[PDB]
């Protein structure tokens, strides 16, 4: 932060996590209460009451668990909250599919030498599950491949770079192959050596 | 027909 | 486990800052602007399919504040330990000269959720077209945040994302220039 402030800070975080397995078929609710980055007390629908996570949360677990009307509202939340919200948003979240744009450009591991790195850029896709493969003359090259890994852009899209280190020879055809749930058949982009 | 999302409400601690 | 929806709220003292958001598999569905009492959908199209009554978020934050003040006293006023962010600058897509692009400043793994962020172009602050996210949750209960700067690539411009946080000794400047 700014303000030139040394004053001590105190933070309280609350998380209601709805975990879905095969859609709404199996649902688990975890309520986490967190003081200064340490979870202190938790409601787990697999249990049906609060449990203290640190001793600082013990008074709350004891007090809330004595209030059976509050427990019964939490115990129903897998239905009244988790399953409800799943149906409200599934069409634009669970079902969201955005096709990646794929480009290839040459690069260098050593700046003073020749192009020896083929970069497959795969950007703008959703969801994050993706498979990227490099081919040379129709045959996969698994050696010499490095990647950024999966990068979350913060705007419901992902990107990645997948790079192949190789010495291009005349006549070779290098092709990046991308598989993703948004497309029926793989996307391919070539680079001619 | 827009779907209405629900919120869960924190429990109040004893003061 | 296919999917996780998280309602994540927080209250921070003495700043009296409180936030309320929903997360799906790591992306923000919406948050509530406390000051405007407004549901802000992360993508505008979401509000075509769903709605949320923002006023309920303010009632939640009031309880969170009360509970925070009870927990603070109960802890004998033990304060949070600052965790400084790690900062990454990247672009939305591979960079091409005078093809519009977006710089992304990704601020990660920090707490408390307070930062001062400035984009600098050639050492000078830029605010045109910038945007940002609220403070996003992590499983270790630290925070994430994204800042964005549309830009037109040029060999003559250099950029820094400057991040200030109480866990840092000095402002953190993460550099970016056209390779």
Residue numbers in the entry:
A (entry chain B): 31 to 223
B (entry chain E): 1 to 15
C (entry chain A): 3 to 181
From the publication, what sentences describe this entry?
Presentation of antigenic peptides by major histocompatibility complex class II (MHC-II) proteins determines T helper cell reactivity. For MHC class II (MHC-II) molecules, which typically reside in late endosomal vesicles, the noncanonical HLA molecule HLA-DM (DM) acts as peptide exchange catalyst. Typically, DM encounters MHC-II in complex with a class II-associated invariant chain peptide (CLIP), the placeholder peptide derived from the invariant chain (CD74) that assists MHC-II proteins during folding. The MHC-II proteins HLA-DR, HLA-DQ and HLA-DP are heterodimers consisting of a highly polymorphic β-chain and an α-chain showing little (HLA-DQ and HLA-DP) or almost no (HLA-DR) polymorphism.
Here, we compare a set of MHC-II proteins consisting of the DRA1*01:01 chain and 12 different DRB1 allotypes in terms of their peptide exchange properties. Although these complexes cover a range of thermal stabilities between 64.1 °C (DRB1*07:01) and 87.3 °C (DRB1*01:02), they all show essentially the same three-dimensional fold. Thus, these CLIP-bound allotypes apparently occupy the stable ground-state structure with CLIP bound in the same canonical orientation and register. Although we see no significant differences in ground-state structure, we still expect polymorphisms to influence CLIP affinity and exchange, as they may alter the dynamic properties of the peptide binding groove. For all analyzed allotypes, CLIP was predicted to bind with its canonical core motif (MRMATPLLM). Interestingly, all allotypes retain the capability to sample the same conformational states MS3 and MS1, but CLIP affinity and pMHCII stability alter the occupancy of states of the individual allotypes.
